[PDB]
C-alpha cells in the first residue's frame, strides 16, 4: 500500500499473507473460512512452494497470535492467463483450520446481485496489505489499509493501456498518491455495509503504483461467487 493508514488492532482480521521459503511475504490473501483462503492466480507463480500466515500485523516482531498454515490444495481458476491477467483468482485449502481470534477472522461472501446492486455502488472499499510503500520502495513491515473509491467502468477502460475484462474492476485515485502496489496482490478488497465487511475484489494489477491517471485493477469477485462456492465444495 502507498499512502493509507496502519491497520490498528483488530481492524483487518481477514488478511492472510503468503510467505515464501525464506519466510518473506510475497502476496496477500483473504480468509474465507477456517479452511480456505482467496488469492490471485498470478500469486502462485511468485514462489515454488509457500505457506499462509494469518494474524500478523508487524512482520518484524512476533506479537503472538500469528500462525503459519500449510496449503493442502491449490485451486487455480482453469482460465487464468498470465498474459491478460484475466480470471486472476485462486482458492487455497489449508491442511489445518484457522483458529479465529483477535486479528484473525473471515470476511463475508456476498450474494451476486445484491453485491453488484448495493456493494459495488457504495463509494469506496478498503484494500489492505504488506506490499510496497511506493513504486520503487520496499515492502511494508506494518500491515496497511487504504480506502479506494470505486471507479466508473468507462473512465477506467479509458485510462488503461491494457484490456479491462468483465472479470476486473477499477478502484483508486486518478491523481492522489494512494494505491495498492507490488506485494499487495491477491490481498483483500472489501466493502463495508452497515457494520459488516464483504469481500468484493482481489488486488490483481495496476500500471505502476499510484501513477497519475491510472487506477488499481481488482478481480471482480461477484463474477466468481458460484465458482468460489464449488471450489469450497
Amino acid at each position: 500500500i502507498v499512502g493509507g493508514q496502519e491497520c490498528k488492532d483488530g481492524e483487518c482480521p481477514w488478511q492472510a499473507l503468503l510467505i515464501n521459503e525464506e519466510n518473506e511475504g510475497f502476496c496477500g490473501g483473504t480468509i474465507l473460512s477456517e479452511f480456505y483462503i482467496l488469492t490471485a492466480a498470478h500469486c502462485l507463480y511468485q514462489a515454488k512452494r509457500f505457506k499462509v500466515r494469518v494474524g500478523d500485523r508487524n512482520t518484524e516482531q512476533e506479537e503472538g497470535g500469528e500462525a503459519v498454515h500449510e496449503v493442502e490444495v491449490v485451486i487455480k481458476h482453469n482460465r487464468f492467463t498470465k498474459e491478460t491477467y484475466d480470471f486472476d483468482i485462486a482458492v487455497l485449502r489449508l491442511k489445518t483450520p484457522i483458529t479465529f481470534r483477535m486479528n484473525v477472522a473471515p470476511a463475508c461472501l456476498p450474494e451476486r446481485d445484491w453485491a453488484e446492486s448495493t456493494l459495488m455502488t457504495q463509494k469506496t472499499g478498503i484494500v489492505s496489505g504488506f506490499g510496497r510503500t511506493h513504486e520503487k520502495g520496499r515492502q511494508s513491515t506494518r500491515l496497511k489499509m487504504l480506502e479506494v473509491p470505486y471507479v466508473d467502468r468507462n473512465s477506467c477502460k479509458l485510462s488503461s493501456s491494457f484490456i479491462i475484462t468483465q472479470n476486473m474492476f477499477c478502484a483508486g485515485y486518478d491523481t492522489k498518491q494512494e494505491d495498492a502496489c507490488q506485494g499487495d496482490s491477491g490481498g483483500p478488497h472489501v466493502t463495508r455495509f452497515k457494520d459488516t465487511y464483504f469481500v468484493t475484489g482481489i488486488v490483481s494489477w495496476g500500471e505502476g503504483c499510484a501513477r497519475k491517471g491510472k487506477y488499481g485493477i481488482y478481480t471482480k469477485v461477484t463474477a466468481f461467487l458460484k465458482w468460489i462456492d464449488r471450489s469450497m465444495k
Partner: protein, 54 residues
C-alpha cells in the same frame, strides 16, 4: 421511484431481495435472521465481516 430493496436496502441488515413485490431479507453464512426478519444475528463468535475489537 425507489422501492423495496432500492429504498435503504429494504430495512435489511444484509442481503435484500424483492420477491413478488415485497422485500425478503437474508444474511451471510454464520448469521441468522432475527424474529423481525430484517436483522442478522451472529450464531458464534468470529462471525464473518466483523473487526475483532468490539
Amino acid at each position: 421511484t425507489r422501492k423495496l430493496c432500492s429504498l435503504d436496502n429494504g430495512d435489511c441488515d444484509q442481503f435484500c431481495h424483492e420477491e413478488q413485490n415485497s422485500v425478503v431479507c437474508s444474511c451471510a453464512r454464520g448469521y441468522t435472521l432475527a424474529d423481525n426478519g430484517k436483522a442478522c444475528i451472529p450464531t458464534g463468535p468470529y462471525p464473518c465481516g466483523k473487526q475483532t475489537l468490539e
